[PDB]
Structure formats: C-alpha cells, structure tokens
Amino acid sequence: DRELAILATAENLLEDRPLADISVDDLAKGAGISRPTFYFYFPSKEAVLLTLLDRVVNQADMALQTLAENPADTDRENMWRTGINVFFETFGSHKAVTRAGQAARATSVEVAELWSTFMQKWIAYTAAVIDAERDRGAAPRTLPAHELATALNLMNERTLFASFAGEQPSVPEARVLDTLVHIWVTSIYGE
Amino acid sequence: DRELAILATAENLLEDRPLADISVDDLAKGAGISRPTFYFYFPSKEAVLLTLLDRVVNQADMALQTLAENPADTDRENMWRTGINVFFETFGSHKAVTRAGQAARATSVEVAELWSTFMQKWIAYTAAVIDAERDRGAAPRTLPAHELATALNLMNERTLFASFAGEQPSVPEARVLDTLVHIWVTSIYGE
Ligand SMILES: CCCc1cc(-c2nc(-c3ccc(C(=O)NCCC(F)(F)F)cc3)cs2)ccn1
Ligand SMILES: CCCc1cc(-c2nc(-c3ccc(C(=O)NCCC(F)(F)F)cc3)cs2)ccn1
C-alpha cells in the first residue's frame, strides 16, 4: 500500500537515474511518507531494488509456467518464439528495473543469488523441453541438452538486455526476437 | 620497464582481489617503486586496468587478423572453431584481467568505449565472413548477417566469461568451445 507506493516511486525514478543517485529521502518523498516510515517497510534502497527485481523475475517465471500448462497449437519455431517472448515482453516492459537489477548483480549477493536461482530454473526447463523433442524424434542428439540450454539462455540474457539498453553493439529491439528464435531453432533442430 | 613491472603487479594482484581492494601503494610496492614514481607512469589504478585490458583485447584482435591472413585448410566447423578459440585462449589465459575489465565497463567510460569499439570490429568481421559464405553458396540467406553476427558475438562474450568466472550457471570451461561452435555452425549454415 505505502509499500506499493515506495516500489512504484523507485521504478519511476530508476527511469531517470541510477540507484546510486536515488536517496531513501527521494523514495519517501515520492511515496508521500517520512524517512523513518520508509525504514518500517524496507531496510535500504538496495532492498527496494531487490523486491522490484524479484517481482519482475517471478512475473516472467509465472508466464513461462502458464505456457507450460497451456501449450500453443503451432510449429516448433512459433513454440520457441512464444517462450522467448515471455522474457522479451516481461523484462522489455520493465527496462529500468532490468538495467538496475543487472547492474546490482555486481554489488548485491542477494541480487546475484536471485538471478542465479531463476536462470538455473529456466535453463533446466529449456533442457527438459529439448530432451522431450529428442525423445519424440523431432530434434537430433547433438550437444548435451543442459550445455546447449545454458548457452542459449546466456545468449538471450546478454542480447535482450543489450537491446533494451540500446548498447553499442546491440541488435535493434524490433529485430531481437526474430534473431534469437533463428539461433534457438537452428541450434536445437540442426544436425 | 618499471611500466611493465606495474602492469605485471596489477595482473598478479587482480588474481587475489578486486581493483576496489588494490591501492596505488600496493602497485608501487609490488613494482619496487614509490607512490609518486607510480604517478609518473599512470594517472590512477583505473588507468592500469585500462592498459591491461587494452593489451589483452589487442592480443585477441591481432590473433584474429593472423587467421584472416593465414586461413587454415579445414571444414567450416573447424574454421569457426579456430576463430572462437582465439577468444577462448586469449581471454582464458588472462582471466583476472577479463573479470576486472568486464566489471570496469560499469564505472569507466574509457573501458566501456574500448570494449564497444572491438566488439563492433569483431561483429563486422563475423558478418563479412558470413556474407562471403552466402556469396559462395555455402550458407543460406536467413537472418541479416550483421544481426546474426551481433547475437553470436554477444553469446560468446557472456558464455566464455561466465565459464571463466565459474558463475552459476555456466558451461564448464572444458565444454564451452564445443558448445559455442555447435551454435555458430548450426545458426550460420542452418535453413
Ligand atoms: C513445451 C510447451 C510449453 C512451452 C515451453 C517453451 C519454453 N521456452 C523456454 C525458454 C526459457 C528461457 C528463455 C530465455 O529467454 N532465457 C533468458 C532469460 C533472460 F532473463 F535472461 F532473458 C526462453 C525460452 C523454455 S521451455 C516455449 C513454448 N512453449
Ligand atoms: C575466413 C578465414 C579466416 C577465419 C576467420 C574466422 C572468424 N572468426 C570470427 C570470430 C569473431 C568473434 C568471435 C567471438 O568469440 N566473439 C566474442 C568475443 C568476446 F571477447 F566477447 F568473447 C569468434 C569468432 C570472425 S571471422 C575464423 C576462422 N578463420
């Protein structure tokens, strides 16, 4: 409530400047509370970013779980596109949290562990689907599925986030989903 | 000379701890010089890391130029393996400089611009070879070559460096070259 106001203030300010340049007083002020009232809800501004990242990561995770439970009736290319799109739309809808959360992996063990935990879960699910595709005779047994999954997930992390940040170099945001789908489909189904 | 001693000291200390935990006095002490003598050679410890990274990046760049000028007599898979191997061996021989240099992209515009400049050069060369392969009828015209090149180069940056750092998740270092070659060959030659 005042908690949701603090989180919304932080996400808004992170569009303008880095967490380094945002004070607890900036977050309190934005949320219409005092500094000590802020400390009732969060121990630090770093905790606010951790909560924002945790919400975005869990949103992507629950969207991927929804696909898993409600698979689309489409070809393998459109299937992998639907999965990559969960990450494109979820993180691409929260670019300031994505940028700040990735930067915080350097300084926060809690942010690093959160990111690590979910990447392990997403890679494990990727590998499980590749193994299912191999089991049904649709994909060839080339690389170990978990190693292939790891590299494809790490490609998407770096490529999606470079695109969102407009880094030089980056794939244009309007081309990045097609670019990643090509590489996933050719590497998963290619001999 | 005393310059090479400062650089060798810094590369040695970076194996033990982050640049944050290395003082100018630590570098002077290691190089057998005083603090003011250090400032005769480098303006800051940040400049020392920039020079170390610049040397490693130029080593990889000159190795790739050597391949370009002395192409191996081998199949397309072993050809791309030779190119990725330049980065695997060069950066993998300097893991502390690689780790510290990547971390410094966050805080140093000079490190960020150096990294950006060379990634643009490597992606441009990748695209040029893919276009040559398309021109000779060996590769199909699928994605725009520069967009495919960008994503493959960014995959290698994230995947090689996660492997060297032993991040969770990462591909084991002994498996990462085969993993990347698979994805490059299938995505460049795959319909
Ligand atoms: C089988 C029927 C249900 C189903 C499953 C999928 C799957 N997609 C993925 C996946 C995982 C991670 C990514 C991914 O982008 N990681 C990187 C995450 C980031 F945060 F770093 F970007 C993409 C797809 C894994 S299974 C797609 C469609 N339908
Ligand atoms: C045509 C005959 C000469 C030739 C050329 C190649 C080429 N290889 C690459 C390349 C570029 C970047 C990478 C790469 O790993 N980037 C990422 C760099 C990093 F620093 F981030 F890791 C790999 C291969 C580009 S052309 C290979 C063999 N023989």
Classify residue B161 by its DSSP letter.
Answer: H
Long-range Cβ pairs for the range A101-106 (8 Å, 24+): A101/A49, A101/A52, A101/A53, A101/A56, A102/A161, A103/A18, A103/A19, A103/B106, A104/A19, A104/A46, A104/A49, A104/A50, A104/A53, A106/B103, A106/B106
Residue nearest to atom 26 of ligand 2 (CA): B126
Contact between chains at A183 and B152 (C-beta distance less than 8 A): yes
Whether the CB-CB separation of A185 and A80 falls below 8 Å is answered with yes
Structure's resolution in angstroms: 1.5
- How buried is residue A133: exposed, middle or buried, by Cβ count under 10 Å (0-12/13-18/19+)? middle
Domain A1-44 fold: Arc Repressor Mutant, subunit A (1.10.10)
Burial A51-69 (b: 16+ CB within 10 A, else e): ebbbebbebbbebbeeeee
Whether the CB-CB separation of B160 and B92 falls below 8 Å is answered with yes
Architecture of domain B45-191: Orthogonal Bundle (1.10)
A85: nearest Cα among A154, A162, A139, A156: A156
CA distance A127 to chain B (A): 13
Residues of chain B with CATH 1.10.10.60: 1-44
Which residues from chain B sit within 8 angstroms of residue A105, using beta carbons? Answer: none
Look at phi and psi of residue A166 and say left if phi exceeds 0, alpha if psi is from -120 to 50, else beta: left
Residues of chain A with CATH 1.10.357.10: 45-191
Structure tokens at A104: 């915080």
Query: In the PDB record, what is the listed experimental method?
Result: X-ray
Determine the 3-state secondary structure of B189 from DSSP: helix
A109: nearest Cα among A39, A40, A18, A46: A46
A68 lines ligand 1 (CB under 6 A): yes
